[PDB]
Amino acid sequence: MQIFVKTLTGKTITLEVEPSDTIENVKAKIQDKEGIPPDQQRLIFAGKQLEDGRTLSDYNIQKESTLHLVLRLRGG
Amino acid sequence: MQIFVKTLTGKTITLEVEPSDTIENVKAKIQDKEGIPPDQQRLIFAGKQLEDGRTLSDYNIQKESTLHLVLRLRGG
Amino acid sequence: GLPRRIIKETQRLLAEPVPGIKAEPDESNARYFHVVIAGPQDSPFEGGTFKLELFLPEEYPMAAPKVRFMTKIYHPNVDKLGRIKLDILTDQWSPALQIRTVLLSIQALLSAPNPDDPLANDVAEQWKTNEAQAIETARAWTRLYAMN
Amino acid sequence: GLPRRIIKETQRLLAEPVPGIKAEPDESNARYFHVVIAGPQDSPFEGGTFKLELFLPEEYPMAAPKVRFMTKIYHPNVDKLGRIKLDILTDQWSPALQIRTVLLSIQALLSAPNPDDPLANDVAEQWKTNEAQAIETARAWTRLYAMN
Amino acid sequence: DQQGYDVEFDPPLESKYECPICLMGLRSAVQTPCGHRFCDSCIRKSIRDTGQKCPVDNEVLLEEQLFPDNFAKREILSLTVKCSNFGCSEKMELRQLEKHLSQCRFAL
Amino acid sequence: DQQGYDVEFDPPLESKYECPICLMGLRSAVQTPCGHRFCDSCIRKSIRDTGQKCPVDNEVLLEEQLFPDNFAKREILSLTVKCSNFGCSEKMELRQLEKHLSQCRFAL
Ligand SMILES: [Zn+2]
Ligand SMILES: [Zn+2]
Ligand SMILES: [Zn+2]
Ligand SMILES: [Zn+2]
Ligand SMILES: [Zn+2]
Ligand SMILES: [Zn+2]
C-alpha cells in the first residue's frame, strides 16, 4: 500500500509499505529519501505521536493515509 | 528558431536563437547551460569549425540543425 | 509589506489545512493567528475545541513563534494563564520548522501529557498521584470550558 | 569482457551516426574500428571517401585513441604513412572526450589545413609557397586515391 | 536582507530547488555535508542567529563546511518563469528575468 | 576497478545523473568547484593519470577541491531500475538492487 508523509517544509512524499511494517521500519525509509536519521524523526497521525515499537496496523494506518514529520522532541 | 547542440558526452541540448546571432553569442548561451567558458568551446557543423566572428546565417544554420561540441584545440 | 515567507506559509497552511486544526490570520495584523485546535481521539479531551493565539515575532523564522491557549484546559504542560511547556518553543528551534508543525506538536501534546517535566505544578502532582482522577477532571474541564 | 564504457560508446555511435562519417567495430576485435570519413564540403577533398583505422588502447579512456589514415591524402597535417598531426591525440587529452568527437575533429581538420604546425614537410612547404597549386594537387589526389 | 528568487515558475518550482528557510528558489545555492541545499545568506543566518547546525536534522554544521552547488545553480537559472509585474504575460528563463524587468512595460 | 552503477534504469537514466568518464549512474557522486558531477574513483583517476583538471572544460582541479554531492546521491539511489539478470522482469529502487541480486532467481 501507499502512505503520504508530509515533510518539515510542507512537501509530501509517498512510500511503499505493508501494515506489518514497524514505525522503526518507516523511519528508516524516510531516512533514505530525505537524509534525516531515524532517532531525530517524530511522526504524527490523528494527533498521536507514533513510537518505534508498534506497527502501522496497530495505529490503523490505511492506504493513502497522510502522516506528518516533526523534528526531535526532548526537554521542555 | 531551434538548434540542436550535441555535447562532449553525447547528450543533446536545444537553444533558442535567430540567424542574426553570432557564434560568440551561441557559445555564450552554451556557457549558461553547461558551464564551459566560450574560449574553450569549438563548434562543428558539416565538418567546418565555426569561428567567433561570423553569424549563423553566414554558415547557413537552419531550424533544427545539429551542431557538435569539441574541447579547446591549440597545438599539434 | 510582510516578509514573503509568511505570505507563502499562510497560503500553504490555509489552502491545505490540517485535519482537526483550524487556523487563519487576523485581518488587521497578519502576524497574529486565530487558531482553534480540536481535541484528539482517545484522550481526556475527546470531542473538545480549544482556541489558541499564535504570534510571529519580528525575526521569524529565526525566532520561534509565541503560542498561548485561549481556553481553560486541565493539562500538566499548560499553565493557568494558557502558556505552553513544549520543547519547540522553549529551546532548540530551527528556521526549517513552520507554523503547521508547531500546531501539530501542540495537538500531539494533548494526547501525551508529561508530568515529569511540568508547568502547572498542582496539575502535574494530581496526574502522578491519582492519574484516573486527573483524566476525569480534564474530561469535565473539556465539557465545561471546551464544548462550544 | 570489454570495458563497459566502450560497449555503450559503440552502441551510441552506431545507433546515432554522424553525417558523413561511417564507423563500425572489427568483428574479431572490438577495440579496432573500421572508420570511413567522407570528404567535407567546399574543400580540396570535396566528394571523396577516406578510410581510417582507429584503435582503443588498454587504459582507454585515460589514454587517447590511436588513429591513422588508410588512404593516400595530400594534406600538410597528415604524413605519408597516414598518421595525423591533430591536437586531441598528441597532447591535452581528457577522458570526457569520446570516439565521436575525435572523428569530428579529423573531419574538421580536412576543411582547415594548417601548414604552420606541419607533419608532411614537403606538403606544408608546397601549401605556403603555392597554395592554389597544392589545393589542385589535393583535388587530384582525391580523384586518384579517394573516389571509390 | 537578500532572500531567494521570488517569482512564479512555470511549471511550478519543484521542492528540490526550494530553500527550506525562505521557501523560494535557491539564490546562490550551497550544499551541506549532510547534503541539502540552501541559499548562501539564509543558512549563514541560521548559523549566526539560531546556531551551528543543519536546520532540517540538527546535524553538525560550521560556516566553513558549506560549499556551492554550482550544478544546481545552473539548472535553476535555466528554469522558465513568468513576468512578476501585474498584467505582463511573457515568459523567459530565470537568468533573463532581471534584464527583462528593466525592459518590462508594466512596472510601477 | 570500480566504475559507476551499471543497470537499465526505468525510465532511462537522465544525463544529469550520468558520469562523463564511465557513462553510467554516479556511484558515490562528487561535484567540482566549476560544478559538475563524477564518480569518486573516476575523477581521481582522471587527476592521477590524465592531470589535475576538470575533464569537460580544462579548469583547475586539485584532488582536495572535490566534495560529495550527497543531495544527488540520495536522488540517484531512489530511481527505479530493472533486474540486470537475463529473464527477470521485476523492478525496484537502485538502493534495493544489491539485496535483490542475491535473492534473484535467474543469476548464474
Ligand atoms: Zn533562502
Ligand atoms: Zn541536514
Ligand atoms: Zn514583462
Ligand atoms: Zn564514473
Ligand atoms: Zn568543469
Ligand atoms: Zn531479479
Author numbering:
A (entry chain C), B (entry chain C): 1 to 76
C (entry chain B), D (entry chain B): 3 to 150
E (entry chain A), F (entry chain A): 53 to 160
Paper text:
One E3 ligase with a critical role in many immune signalling pathways is TNF receptor-associated factor 6 (TRAF6). TRAF6 preferentially builds Lys63-linked ubiquitin chains by virtue of its interaction with the Ubc13-Uev1A (also called Ube2N-Ube2V1) E2 complex following engagement of receptors. Both structures show that the Ubc13~Ub conjugate contacts both protomers of the TRAF6 dimer.
We therefore expressed and purified a truncated construct that contained the RING and just ZF1 of D. rerio TRAF6 (denoted DrRZ1). TRAF6 RZ1 formed a stable complex with Ubc13~Ub that allowed purification and crystallisation of the complex. The structure was solved at 3.4 Å and contains two 1:1 DrRZ1-Ubc13~Ub complexes in the asymmetric unit. The α-carbons of the two symmetrical RZ1 complexes overlay with an RMSD of 0.4 Å, and both are similar to the RZ3 complex, with an RMSD of 0.9 and 1.5 Å. In the TRAF6-Ubc13~Ub complex, there are close contacts between ubiquitin and two Arg residues in the linker-helix and ZF1 of the interacting protomer. Whereas, Arg147 from ZF1 packs against Asp32 of ubiquitin.
